Write an enzyme that holds these catalytic residues in place. Structure first.
Site, PDB file in Angstrom:
ATOM      1  N   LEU F  40       0.833  -1.191   0.000  1.00 36.86           N
ATOM      2  CA  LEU F  40       0.000   0.000   0.000  1.00 36.86           C
ATOM      3  C   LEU F  40       0.874   1.249   0.000  1.00 36.86           C
ATOM      4  CD1 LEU F  40      -2.441  -1.265   2.742  1.00 36.86           C
ATOM      5  CD2 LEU F  40      -2.800  -1.355   0.279  1.00 36.86           C
ATOM      6  N   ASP F  41       0.241   2.395  -0.228  1.00 38.06           N
ATOM      7  CA  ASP F  41       0.928   3.676  -0.144  1.00 38.06           C
ATOM      8  C   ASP F  41       0.407   4.482   1.045  1.00 38.06           C
ATOM      9  OD1 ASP F  41      -0.904   5.699  -2.606  1.00 38.06           O
ATOM     10  OD2 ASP F  41      -1.560   4.428  -0.953  1.00 38.06           O
ATOM     11  N   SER F  42       0.814   5.739   1.134  1.00 38.00           N
ATOM     12  CA  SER F  42       0.511   6.559   2.294  1.00 38.00           C
ATOM     13  C   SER F  42      -0.930   7.039   2.308  1.00 38.00           C
ATOM     14  CB  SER F  42       1.439   7.760   2.331  1.00 38.00           C
ATOM     15  OG  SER F  42       1.331   8.382   1.088  1.00 38.00           O
ATOM     16  N   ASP F  44      -3.326   5.354   1.244  1.00 38.40           N
ATOM     17  CA  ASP F  44      -4.013   4.181   1.769  1.00 38.40           C
ATOM     18  C   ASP F  44      -3.871   4.088   3.280  1.00 38.40           C
ATOM     19  OD1 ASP F  44      -4.475   3.739  -0.866  1.00 38.40           O
ATOM     20  OD2 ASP F  44      -3.348   1.872  -1.003  1.00 38.40           O
TER      21      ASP F  44
END
Ligand SMILES: CCCCCCCCCCCCCCCCCC(=O)OC[C@H](COP(=O)([O-])OCC[N+](C)(C)C)OC(=O)CCCCCCCCCCCCCCCCC
Ligand SMILES: CCCCCCCCCCCCCCCCCC(=O)OC[C@H](COP(=O)(O)OCCN)OC(=O)CCCCCCCCCCCCCCCCC
Ligand SMILES: CCCCCCCCCCCCO[C@@H]1O[C@H](CO)[C@@H](O[C@H]2O[C@H](CO)[C@@H](O)[C@H](O)[C@H]2O)[C@H](O)[C@H]1O
Ligand SMILES: CCCCCCCCCCCCO[C@@H]1O[C@H](CO)[C@@H](O[C@H]2O[C@H](CO)[C@@H](O)[C@H](O)[C@H]2O)[C@H](O)[C@H]1O
Ligand SMILES: CCCCCCCCCCCCO[C@@H]1O[C@H](CO)[C@@H](O[C@H]2O[C@H](CO)[C@@H](O)[C@H](O)[C@H]2O)[C@H](O)[C@H]1O
Ligand SMILES: CCCCCCCCCCCCO[C@@H]1O[C@H](CO)[C@@H](O[C@H]2O[C@H](CO)[C@@H](O)[C@H](O)[C@H]2O)[C@H](O)[C@H]1O
Ligand SMILES: CCCCCCCCCCCCO[C@@H]1O[C@H](CO)[C@@H](O[C@H]2O[C@H](CO)[C@@H](O)[C@H](O)[C@H]2O)[C@H](O)[C@H]1O
Ligand SMILES: *C(=O)CCCCCCCCCCCCC
Lengths: 127, 459, 171, 104, 55, 86, 172, 56, 120, 155, 80, 67
Positions: F40-42, F44
């Site tokens: 995931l990313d930030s 998210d």
């Protein structure tokens, strides 16, 4: 979007202040040394706040300066000038002269009416 | 009055001949017994005052003040004995002697039948009070506070001395009973304007009058707790008592000479109530509260009506018990945290529950919650001032709003909120401290049941 | 009973007789009977007991009578010995007059409550008597100040009498 | 963006101490160690002590003290209607005069 | 965690619920009249409160 | 309220993540780093913390939230704020 | 400002989502508009020019201020919420137990036995905690408010007492 | 008059008794809230009697 | 009502003024008006302690209702017929006042016609 | 504390501005005295006029209720800016616009009330009539004067 | 006493307004990855709630029946 | 206790609480319908409102415009 008009009692949000953004290495330097002063004062406090053998009040020089600055330090730094004399005259003599003429005028009217019999005092026997 | 003067003097041999560990027990026990017998002064008649001899008399004005004075001496002893514990034994005995000698001058001052005898005793209270402040105060500023206290009083007292002697030369007597029958009206002249001022300025400084009040925040703050208790409760009332007596011989000139001083008071109370909202020192806040309350007494005495004299008498008694209790409450905090700064220790109701009840009761009496005698006096003064001029209801009403704000501000700031984390020496309230608080509030609240004995001669 | 009916008058009481127009039982009637049995009766016996003790120890107290002394009108000026007695008398009569106005005010308040919605017409006599007594009290004692005395009362009367003479002189 | 290893380790060590502290707040079975020390009857003594004894005192106080003084208890006089019979005197209050007895 | 099954909660509200239904009717029918109730008016003044409430 | 437990908190933290369509429920463990493991990313991560606030009904300040990168850290943060010791 | 550009965008994202949730109320309506809002943030995810990225952030803040809810939702125990600081009046510091009368302490003999062990553990660790802080702090004091862990066995993390022994969130 | 006046004062006196008990340490603080609630319920009953007399 | 629209947005010279009405003699246009009859004596309303605003021309019905109310206690649902008798009487009183307003308006209307026709 | 650590006079020279800033635990760049207008501020620092309600709630303040740290200079008006008193936080609506809408609403309502008092609402009904010369005796009229007769007729 | 949570595989947006949202997002090419976290609010005993009109008419059915039964009794009580 | 909390599920109810709620909801509607039947006047109007324009000039004593 109408722009934010800051007032004295309605300050400007940081998210809309330009100074918050476009940061320079000079601003990031000021923040670093601001955080240093806070960190140094925190360590000095914590070393006493956490001391097991301490029982009492952790004397705070900042509080002492504040209460002293707002009492004993005012007259030494007072200077009679145009600003202070006009303010002192306005807020010191001003209200006293005002209320004098208010009450003197009101009471002179009442006495005049009582002399002639034009003031109703039918049941007034408590004073 | 010898049945009170002599036993009050005998407190001095009692203290000096006591065992070193019984000076507080003995003096407190026996000053309470004197306090008990002072109730015999309430043999008051509707028409005649109680005239004992050529020297002393008692009336419904002096009687409640005498009872308050003799009741305060026991309370001042309990309040003092903690912070004088380390004191040298002989210096402890001298401290008690000053309090006893102060009581002796007070009970004679309130009962002297001749005004020059009143003047000498009125002035004799300066000496023990000055010694108490300067010798046993804690701070450097106590020395300056003594000088302000001394010279503010004397600057007004010395003209009074000349005026009284002038009155005796021209009238032939200063006996107060004689002055009731031989009084003559005061006709307008620049000569009589200054006779009036010399008769009233000494008493105004003691009240204090707004403008001449600067000595009181200094003196009431630098003094030891016992010194503050007597300064607020009784010594301020020498000014009110003196005015109530001498205004007899100042009519009708009081009609227009009162105006500058009514203005200073009506506006002064709003100014000194507002000051209390931004005070950082708890003792200083209480001191400025006394100025606000005594402004009503000045106005009530000057407008000179039957309701205002009853209200003034009630206010003087009620303020004495309340202001004394507040100083004692603030002292208990100070004896724990060794600072007068109000914001220093917060949320104390969490750590000292019962003592927070005393704070509430003291605060409620200060903001004149009915039917306390604080409200009774403050209401009677407002009733008579409204008749004097209807617009005064605006200034009285505003002061009542501001007084509630600072009374509850002090309660909220010190007792509510969150406790200060780093202050960890808040020991539980001692029995001495709880009893000292209840000996103010209980008599104060009991008097509501029978308020006629504190309404003065015009009841 | 205990007080004088003349000083504190009360018109004759006229209570209508019960005229129930319902078959239902009246709860107040049975509550009244319960109150008499459970409250009035035991309370009455306790009082009758106490009255039996007070009859065994009967003793009297008196109402002080004050002989009349000369008024301040008869006092030579600055003669304190005669001034004192006149002044004390004047102060005694001042307190009594205050209580007289209180009696008249108490009659007026009792009438207003007693007459209900008809008070505006049925209390006209008490209103008039209150108006007259308050006028007399105001003339005697109003505006004297906190340091009032027989001397000041006399000066107020003389000023009033002088104006009355002048107004008649106009006629 | 997460914790640094030093940050994680300090949190780990505080957590052990905090949870041990919270566990020690639990009371033992014997604590607190105290020192030495149906509706009808329950409702009856309440009515007795809070309703009957007070009303006894108040009725005595009103009947032999308050009502022995003038104008302490002042009642609005009863409403009298045409056709009523006065109990004090037996006087019969006359009826009202005849209406037009109109109805609708 | 919804739960309104405590008898203290139920009984206290139940008494005020009975009051909110019948108390107005009981009081109005037991208080003596002290005015002249104005009962004659046009239909649109009689039902004003009811209509604006529905709207 | 019914008291929380470390196992009770852990179950609900994993429960919420299993209902997030960007996380494989079979590759997920209490130790799964949101970026390194779950990919995931930030943006998210902000939604995950937002979902745990709604789940447990209290807010996690942004300065604290940005450091919670695995389900175990969220479990530890919540138990710490709620005085859960088991 | 001491927040990086990343931290400002991420904070703005959460704040705008919460205010969006306050307008929408209904969960399904919120989910629809939360995804449109996410799409807008994803649309400039890879903007490389910091100057253009900053201008985008500036406009987004201006738009957020115009469209914020005048009465947003606050968690009850969050600052500004209806239960914030509700239980502060029940939080009593642990040192108050030292003043308890012996007859009060005799009611909880087991609790005060453990308490003594904790106080013993506080005394015996204090010196090492001070020494560790002294030897890890550069000259001129610390530059941050961060603190180190314990580095050894038996060492406790410096300055732990008031973290470990703080009052419970629901004390009474 | 005797019942009306008497009952209309017990209502007010009844409500002060929990205050007097609390302030004078003569209560069983087991269920003080229930005690206060019970006293209010009994005050309501005694207050109805004067009201019924007024209604009548 | 419409009357306000006529007086405020229309011509107020032909509209009754509620404060000063009536502005015409009672007998104008009414040869021999009967004087309103009062049934209840002043003493009877006094002894019933009616509220002064209630001592109008319908007071005799109110007295009957209040007497019935007392005698029917505790049955607070009796006296319905007596209450209606009083309510109906007050309705007829209100209708009379409505007629007095219409008579005043119709005269002010006439007084303008008798002035316009005379004016021309 | 010692005399060297208490507030002093207005700082005249950069060396005194550096001593004052150090005394108050401030950076010399951030230190700004009040103007030297003779009002008695001395060298006490001029800090931004903001409520304590404006500070970060989530930071670990030494005085959480006050949101102050031990040792930091307190605003001259600190007691006026506690969270119980004056709040300066940003508002969703501009201050000047807020005043316009509040005043405008109040002025308009007061104007409309004056209009409604000029054009009162009433029913098309003549005055209520009372018997016995308009209840002359009941309303307190003198029984010794025969009142101006008041006659009400049928219609 | 472990609280057994319901199996997470039972929460599905199908047959709820959340499925409508997904379709309106699918048109623009987006997805809602948290829809299944909201599904419990549209399922089970929380599915199907009264309307505002229905809320007011709670108890109207039995209240009316009692009203019908009451007037019949009252009516015949007058006639007989 | 008597009621246990549930996770993401509609809560447990007692028979008593549901029955009592229905009874008092039903009692509300019986009361409104009962009163409306016997007291519709209090909602719709107690007395007719006369139409003043329907009153004859002789009823009101408005004399002919000649005399
Ligand atoms: C219950 C309902 C709730 C009411 C609240 C509770 C309060 C009422 C309970 C008390 C009822 C009894 C009662 O009131 O009677 C009392 C009565 C008042 O009612 P009384 O006037 O009718 O007296 C009753 C006795 N006879 C009938 C003979 C008159 O007396 C008192 O009030 C006592 C006065 C006490 C004041 C003296 C204070 C002590 C002085 C010590 C000296 C040092 C103090 C400092 C000096 C200050 C300067 C003076
Ligand atoms: C204009 C025309 C409209 C009608 C005007 C009629 C008068 C109404 C206005 C009354 C005065 C307005 C000030 C009221 C202050 C107040 O209510 O206290 C609340 C204030 C902050 O409270 P709050 O806004 O709720 O903040 C929540 C936390 N953020 O907290 C505070 O600051 C109060 C505590 C500090 C003490 C400040 C005291 C201010 C004194 C000024 C008020 C008036 C004083 C008496 C004079 C008025 C009477 C003549
Ligand atoms: C806080 C300070 C308060 C200060 C209050 C100031 C009060 C001022 C009072 C002024 C009134 C003094 O009283 C006044 O004195 C003068 C004396 O010259 C008297 O008058 C006498 O001298 C003047 C000369 O000036 C002549 O006009 C007059 O013919 C003569 O009789 C007045 O008859 C008297 O009315
Ligand atoms: C510190 C606050 C200062 C606020 C300002 C206060 C100003 C106060 C001025 C003092 C009063 C001066 O004004 C004073 O008024 C009264 C009347 O009321 C006058 O009184 C005298 O004159 C009047 C008529 O004028 C006569 O009835 C009579 O001879 C006497 O009463 C005084 O001769 C005058 O000196
Ligand atoms: C001037 C006053 C005149 C009246 C004086 C009458 C005094 C009689 C006082 C009796 C006791 C009053 O004080 C208190 O009363 C209540 C009710 O009985 C008791 O309380 C008891 O009943 C209540 C409810 O029924 C329970 O909530 C409570 O758990 C239980 O202890 C207290 O245990 C008792 O201490
Ligand atoms: C059912 C409700 C019954 C009561 C209804 C009461 C209505 C009261 C209406 C009062 C309106 C007063 O508010 C009024 O609004 C406009 C629009 O912002 C303000 O005008 C302001 O808005 C815009 C700019 O944003 C510009 O037109 C203008 O430059 C600016 O001053 C006025 O300065 C203000 O006086
Ligand atoms: C003074 C007037 C008094 C009037 C009293 C009238 C009688 C009181 C009626 C109480 C009703 C009790 O019965 C209650 O009714 C409701 C509505 O039908 C039922 O609810 C019914 O519909 C719902 C959904 O539509 C179902 O979930 C339920 O299974 C079904 O029975 C309750 O399951 C039942 O418990
Ligand atoms: C005229 O009779 C004066 C009444 C003043 C305004 C009353 C408001 C009634 C509105 C009627 C409109 C119909 C909607 C129910």
């Amino acid at each position: 979007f109408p722009k934010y008009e800051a007032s004295r009692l309605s300050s400007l949000p940081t998210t809309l202040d330009p100074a918050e953004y476009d940061i320079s290495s000079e601003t990031r330097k000021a923040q670093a040394e601001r955080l240093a002063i806070r960190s140094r004062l925190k360590r000095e406090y914590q070393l006493q706040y956490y001391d097991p053998s301490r029982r009492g009040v952790i004397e705070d020089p900042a509080l002492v300066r504040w209460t002293y600055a707002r009492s004993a330090n005012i007259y030494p730094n007072f200077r009679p000038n145009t600003k202070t004399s006009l303010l002192g005259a306005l807020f010191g003599i001003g209200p006293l002269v005002f209320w004098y003429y208010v009450f003197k005028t009101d009471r002179d009217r009442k006495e005049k009416l009582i002399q002639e019999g034009k003031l109703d005092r039918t049941f007034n026997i408590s004073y | 009055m010898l049945k009170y003067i002599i036993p009050t003097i005998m407190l001095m041999p009692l203290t000096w001949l006591s065992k070193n560990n019984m000076i507080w027990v003995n003096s407190t026990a026996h000053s309470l017994l004197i306090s008990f017998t002072s109730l015999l002064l309430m043999n008051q008649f509707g028409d005649n005052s109680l005239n004992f001899s050529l020297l002393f008399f008692s009336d419904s004005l002096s009687t409640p003040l005498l009872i308050l004075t003799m009741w305060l001496l026991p309370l001042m002893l309990m309040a003092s004995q903690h912070h004088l514990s380390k004191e040298n034994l002989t210096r402890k005995k001298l401290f008690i002697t000053m309090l006893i000698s102060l009581q002796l001058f007070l009970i004679m001052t309130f009962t002297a039948m001749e005004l020059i005898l009143f003047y000498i005793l009125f002035e004799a209270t300066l000496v023990p009070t000055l010694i108490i402040i300067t010798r046993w105060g804690n701070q450097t500023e106590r020395l300056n506070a003594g000088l302000y206290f001394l010279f503010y009083t004397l600057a007004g007292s010395l003209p009074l001395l000349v005026a009284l002697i002038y009155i005796q030369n021209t009238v032939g007597s200063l006996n107060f009973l004689m002055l009731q029958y031989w009084v003559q009206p005061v006709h307008n002249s620049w000569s009589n304007v200054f006779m009036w001022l010399a008769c009233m300025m000494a008493f105004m400084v003691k009240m204090p009058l707004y403008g001449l009040h600067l000595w009181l925040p200094k003196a009431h703050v630098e003094a030891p707790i016992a010194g503050s208790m007597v300064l607020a409760a009784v010594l301020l009332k020498l000014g009110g008592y003196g005015m109530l007596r001498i205004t007899l011989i100042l009519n009708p000139m009081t009609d227009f000479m009162a105006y500058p001083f009514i203005m200073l008071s009506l506006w002064g109370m709003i100014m000194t109530s507002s000051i209390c909202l931004r005070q950082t020192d708890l003792k200083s806040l209480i001191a400025y509260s006394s100025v606000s309350h005594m402004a009503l007494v000045i106005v009530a005495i000057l407008i000179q009506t039957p309701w205002s004299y009853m209200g003034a008498t009630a206010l003087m008694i009620a303020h004495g018990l309340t202001s004394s209790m507040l100083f004692c409450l603030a002292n208990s905090n100070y004896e724990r945290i060794h600072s007068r700064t109000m914001i220093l220790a917060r949320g104390l109701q969490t750590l000292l529950p019962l003592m927070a009840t005393w704070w509430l009761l003291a605060s409620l009496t200060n903001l004149a919650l009915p039917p306390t005698i604080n409200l009774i006096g403050e209401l009677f003064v407002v009733m008579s001032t409204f008749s004097w001029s209807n617009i005064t209801i605006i200034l009285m009403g505003v002061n009542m709003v501001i007084t509630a704000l600072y009374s509850l501000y002090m309660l909220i700031m010190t007792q509510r909120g969150k406790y200060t984390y780093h202050i960890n020496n808040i020991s539980p309230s001692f029995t001495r401290e709880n009893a000292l608080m209840s000996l103010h509030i209980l008599p104060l609240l009991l008097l509501t049941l029978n308020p006629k004995i504190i309404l003065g001669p015009l009841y | 009973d205990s007080w004088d009916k003349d000083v504190y008058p009360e018109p004759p009481r006229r209570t209508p007789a019960p005229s129930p127009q319902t078959s239902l039982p009246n709860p107040i009637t049975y509550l009244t009977k319960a109150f008499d049995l459970l409250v009035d009766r035991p309370v009455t016996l306790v009082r009758e007991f106490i009255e039996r003790q007070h009859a065994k120890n009967k003793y009297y107290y008196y109402h002080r009578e004050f002989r009349r002394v000369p008024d301040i009108t008869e006092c030579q000026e600055k003669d304190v010995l005669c001034m004192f007695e006149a002044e004390m008398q004047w102060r005694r009569d001042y307190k009594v007059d205050q209580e007289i106005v209180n009696i008249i005010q108490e009659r007026l308040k009792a009438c207003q409550q007693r007459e209900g919605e008809s008070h505006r017409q049925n209390c006209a006599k008490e209103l008039e008597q209150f108006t007259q007594v308050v006028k007399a009290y105001q003339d005697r004692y109003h505006d004297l100040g906190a340091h009032y005395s027989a001397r000041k009362c006399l000066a107020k009367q003389k000023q009033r009498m002088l104006a009355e003479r002048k107004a008649a002189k106009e006629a | 963006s997460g914790y640094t290893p030093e940050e994680k380790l300090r949190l780990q060590q505080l957590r052990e101490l905090r949870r041990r502290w919270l566990k020690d707040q639990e009371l033992s079975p014997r604590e607190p160690v105290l020192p030495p020390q149906y509706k009808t009857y329950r409702h009856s003594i309440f009515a007795f002590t809070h309703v009957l004894i007070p009303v006894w005192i108040i009725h005595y106080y009103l009947k032999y003290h308050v009502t022995t003084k003038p104008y302490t208890i002042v009642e609005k006089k009863p409403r009298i209607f045409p056709g009523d019979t006065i109990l004090e005197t037996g006087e019969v209050i006359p009826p009202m005069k005849e209406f037009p007895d109109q109805h609708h | 965690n919804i739960n309104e099954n405590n008898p203290l909660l139920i009984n206290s509200i139940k008494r005020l619920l009975i009051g909110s239904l019948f108390a107005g009717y009981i009081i109005s029918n037991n208080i003596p009249p002290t005015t002249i109730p104005q009962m004659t008016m046009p239909y649109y003044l009689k039902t004003t409160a009811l209509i604006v409430t529905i709207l | 309220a019914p008291p929380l437990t470390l196992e009770g908190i852990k179950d609900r933290v994993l429960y919420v993540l299993k209902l997030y369509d960007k996380i494989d429920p079979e590759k997920l463990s209490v130790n799964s780093h949101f970026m390194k493991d779950l990919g995931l990313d930030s943006l998210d991560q902000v939604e995950i913390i937002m979902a745990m606030e709604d789940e447990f009904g209290f807010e996690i300040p942004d300065i604290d939230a940005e450091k919670l990168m695995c389900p175990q850290e969220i479990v530890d943060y919540i138990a710490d704020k709620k005085d859960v010791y088991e | 400002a001491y927040l990086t550009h990343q931290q400002k965008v991420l904070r703005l994202y959460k704040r705008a989502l919460r205010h969006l949730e306050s307008w929408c109320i209904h969960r399904d309506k919120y989910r629809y508009f939360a995804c449109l809002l996410r799409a807008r943030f994803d649309e400039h995810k890879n903007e490389k020019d910091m100057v253009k990225a900053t201008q985008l952030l500036r406009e987004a803040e201006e738009e957020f201020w115009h469209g914020q809810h005048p009465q947003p939702y606050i968690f009850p125990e969050s600052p500004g919420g209806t239960s914030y600081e509700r239980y502060e009046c029940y939080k009593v510091p642990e040192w108050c137990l030292d003043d308890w009368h012996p007859s009060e302490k005799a009611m909880y003999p087991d609790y005060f036995a453990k308490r003594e062990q904790w106080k013993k553990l506080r005394r015996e660790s204090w010196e090492r905690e001070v020494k560790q802080l002294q030897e890890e702090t550069p000259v001129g004091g610390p530059r941050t408010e961060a603190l180190p862990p314990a580095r050894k066995q038996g060492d406790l993390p410096p300055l732990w007492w008031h973290i470990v022994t703080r009052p419970r969130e629901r004390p009474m | 008059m005797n019942m009306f006046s008497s009952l209309s004062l017990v209502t007010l006196l009844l409500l002060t008794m929990p205050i007097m008990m609390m302030s004078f340490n003569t209560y069983k603080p087991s269920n003080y809230p229930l005690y206060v609630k019970t006293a209010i319920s009994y005050a309501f009953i005694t207050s109805m009697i004067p009201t019924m007399m007024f209604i009548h | 009502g419409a009357h306000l629209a006529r007086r405020y947005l229309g011509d107020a010279s032909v509209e009754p003024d509620p404060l000063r009405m009536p502005t015409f003699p009672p007998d104008y246009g009414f040869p021999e008006r009967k004087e309103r009859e009062m049934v209840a004596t002043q003493q009877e309303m006094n002894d019933a302690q009616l509220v002064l605003q209630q001592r109008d021309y319908c007071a005799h019905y109110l007295i009957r209702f209040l007497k019935c109310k007392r005698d029917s206690f505790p049955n607070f649902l009796a006296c319905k017929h007596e209450r209606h008798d009083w309510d109906y009487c007050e309705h007829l009183d209100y209708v009379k006042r409505m007629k007095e307003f219409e008579r005043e308006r119709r005269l002010l209307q006439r007084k303008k016609r008798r002035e316009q026709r005379e004016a021309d | 504390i010692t005399k060297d650590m208490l507030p002093g006079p207005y700082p005249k020279t950069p060396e005194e501005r550096a001593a004052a800033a150090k005394k108050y635990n401030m950076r010399v760049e951030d230190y700004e005295p009040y103007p030297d207008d003779g009002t008695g501020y001395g060298d006490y620092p001029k800090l931004p006029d903001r409520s304590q309600q404006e500070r970060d709630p989530w930071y670990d303040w030494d005085h959480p209720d006050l949101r102050l740290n031990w040792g930091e200079p307190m605003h001259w008006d600190l007691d006026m800016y506690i969270r119980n008193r004056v709040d300066t936080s940003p508002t969703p609506v501009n201050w000047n616009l807020m005043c316009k809408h509040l005043f405008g609403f109040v002025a308009f309502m007061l104007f409309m009330f004056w209009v409604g008092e000029t054009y009162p609402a009433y029913q098309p009904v003549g005055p209520k009539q009372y018997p016995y010369n308009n209840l002359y005796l009941e309303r307190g009229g003198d029984p010794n004067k025969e009142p101006e007769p008041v006659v009400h007729y049928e219609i | 006493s472990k609280m057994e949570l319901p199996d997470y595989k039972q929460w599905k947006i199908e047959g709820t307004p959340l499925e409508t949202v997904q379709e309106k997002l699918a048109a623009r090419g987006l997805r809602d990855p948290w829809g299944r976290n909201e599904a419990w609010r549209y399922m089970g005993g929380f599915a199907n709630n009264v309307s505002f009109v229905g809320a007011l008419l709670k108890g109207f059915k039995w209240g009316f029946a009692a009203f019908v039964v009451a007037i019949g009794a009252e009516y015949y009580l007058e006639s007989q | 206790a008597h009621i246990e909390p549930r996770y993401r599920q509609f809560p447990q109810l007692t028979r008593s609480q549901v029955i009592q709620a229905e009874f008092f909801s039903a009692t509300m509607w019986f009361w409104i319908l009962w009163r409306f039947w016997h007291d519709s006047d209090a909602v719709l109007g107690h007395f007719p409102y006369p139409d003043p324009s329907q009153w004859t000039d002789e009823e009101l004593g408005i004399p002919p415009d000649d005399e």
